[PDB]
Ligand binder design. Structure first.
Ligand SMILES: [Sr+2]
Ligand SMILES: [Sr+2]
Ligand SMILES: [Sr+2]
Ligand SMILES: [Sr+2]
Lengths: 346, 346
């Protein structure tokens, strides 16, 4: 029952180690510039806001209306939706995954630093995506809660290696990308829920999309500041992430029945257009467009090489990973334990 | 709407910094001696095992029997139960809280080290206490899910400072105690559930108690090994935790209506005997008895002082915090937001 590890060696602390001060200093800055994309807790939605209300006479019809509506949502949609849920539910991983980042560490789990206060606060805002999506799935009864929960144990136990190497540079570039990635996914799970006739589910995806949107604003804004304080090394770390490929935080997914779980899940995301290869390019393309890496000047010989790599990459990815729709045309039908070994088109 | 921080200054890295090697070396040891108190995922229970089964014709009666049964459980019990659930739900915090501990860090979120593999794996086993206890509360409809969810946002956003100061010594002593603490709580929530006539809920606490039991076995076993490799400093760190008081991982609890949430919750835990001050002493007493700190010899002048402090402390706590039951006799009735501003005896 051997789960997956990743196939790359360990790389810890791959950043000039004095540079903990670039971030030490930016403490006040971050307070004024990131700690505002915080909605105060008292103004945030919570999951209860979208699920049947168990302390109302309405509870019964609400659960029943829920389940009826979910019958009209097809099995493939559910696979994708479950994928997302599990990713989201693996949250403790990502709080650790920001807390490995060197300059912007929490040091005591309650550190008064601006970075930490943001970390705790971001985590807190993300942790309710889990609750909501899970309670929703549990109620629909369209999916096998027990396998889904196991996959989660299997995921949290193995974490992920997104190859940030404790670098606040690399990290904040990664999240920037990954956060937009999830917003696009959740955006389409939403649209599509709507088109299948279940607005309440759309609204659930809709809202979650909308949180990530806010986080991507924050995260792009830390990387943007670093393109001013260190144009050389920030392109250098951005070119570094792109060679490495951005591997989504759930690549180690294991249900105990499938060695290509992630691969297979992703095939379905792709087929339904929830998160295609196409989309992948646009995220990089947006990021080059947004960070104005395009317009940077005075770079070292190694910096100039990194720029023209990153800039003319989206065109390339678009094509070679075009011909991976011409692989979703005549693709096999295959079971997923998450839906009781029923079978969706891969 | 200002939440609580803690009233003690920051103390990071308070352990002789070469000692990362004592733990680097103990890697093989830990593999043979801690990574066995791991139940392989495929053999673990998941939350679905204890809740109504939504993809079964049974679903409806099972939810209905659940809620009927929870009407027979009183409001005070639920406050305590909720306390626990929120504590458990704040999980991401504790993964971070082990990952600050110096010698035994995860360094990339997927570190092949034995300590890390145990950390991820412990985390994974604990994260289902959340799912389960939450789903159960949600279904009962006896409590206000939206406040409970907010408290959790308020908790995760502020973390905790249990005063371990990145010390694997201090940390592992702390968890050792705190893990026993939760086992005793969960134990009584269980017994009491049973006495109020709800076996299924008892079984839920029962199981969770049973996980913590295993974890305390593991954690006591790391501290016991340190009483062999460093008798001096491990008593010194144990006497250090006891002067500091062991402040449970939810002390910063905030619902947005109550500045003494934690105090007040705790009052109720106490009143029902779910986790008293009495209990507190027994955990220390058990720990002195189990670690044989009693029988240690050849300590420095500072070590000998630390021993006789820790040894004759349980007697003391027992008495002075005896007369805090004669404060639960004629105590006020007061509302909790978690139960719709209904009123339990504090
Ligand atoms: Sr959760
Ligand atoms: Sr099932
Ligand atoms: Sr029902
Ligand atoms: Sr409500």
């Amino acid at each position: 029952f051997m789960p997956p590890r990743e196939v790359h060696v360990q790389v810890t602390h791959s950043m000039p180690p004095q540079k903990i001060e670039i971030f030490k200093s930016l403490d006040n800055w971050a307070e004024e510039n990131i700690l505002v994309h915080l909605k105060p807790v008292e103004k945030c939605w919570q999951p209860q806001d979208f699920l049947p209300d168990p302390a109302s006479d309405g509870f019964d019809e609400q659960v029943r209306e829920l389940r009826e509506r979910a019958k009209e949502i097809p099995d493939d949609y559910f696979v994708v939706l479950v994928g997302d849920m599990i990713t989201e539910e693996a949250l403790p991983t990502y709080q650790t995954m920001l807390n490995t980042l060197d300059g912007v560490r929490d040091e005591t789990g309650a550190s008064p630093t601006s970075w930490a206060i943001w970390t705790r606060a971001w985590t807190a805002e993300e942790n309710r995506h889990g609750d909501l999506l899970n309670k929703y799935l549990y109620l629909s009864g369209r999916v096998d809660m027990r396998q889904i929960e196991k996959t989660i144990q299997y995921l949290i136990g193995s974490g992920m290696d997104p190859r940030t190497e404790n670098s606040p540079y690399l990290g904040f570039i990664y999240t920037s990308f990954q956060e937009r990635a999830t917003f696009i996914s959740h955006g389409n799970t939403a649209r599509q829920a709507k088109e299948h006739g279940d607005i309440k589910l759309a609204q659930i995806c809709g809202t979650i999309a909308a949180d990530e949107k806010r986080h991507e604003t924050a995260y792009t804004k830390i990387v943007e500041k670093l393109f001013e304080i260190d144009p050389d090394g920030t392109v250098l770390a951005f070119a570094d992430m792109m060679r490495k490929k951005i591997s989504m935080p759930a690549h180690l997914m294991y249900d105990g029945r499938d060695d290509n779980l992630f691969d297979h899940f992703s095939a379905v995301a792709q087929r339904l257009g929830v998160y295609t290869a196409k989309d992948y390019a646009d995220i990089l393309e947006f990021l080059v467009g947004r960070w104005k890496v395009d317009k940077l000047t005075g770079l070292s010989a190694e910096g100039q090489k990194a720029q023209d790599y990153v800039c003319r990459l989206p065109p390339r990815i678009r094509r070679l990973e075009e011909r991976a729709q011409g692989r979703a045309k005549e693709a096999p039908t295959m079971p997923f334990s998450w839906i009781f070994d029923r079978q969706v088109k891969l």
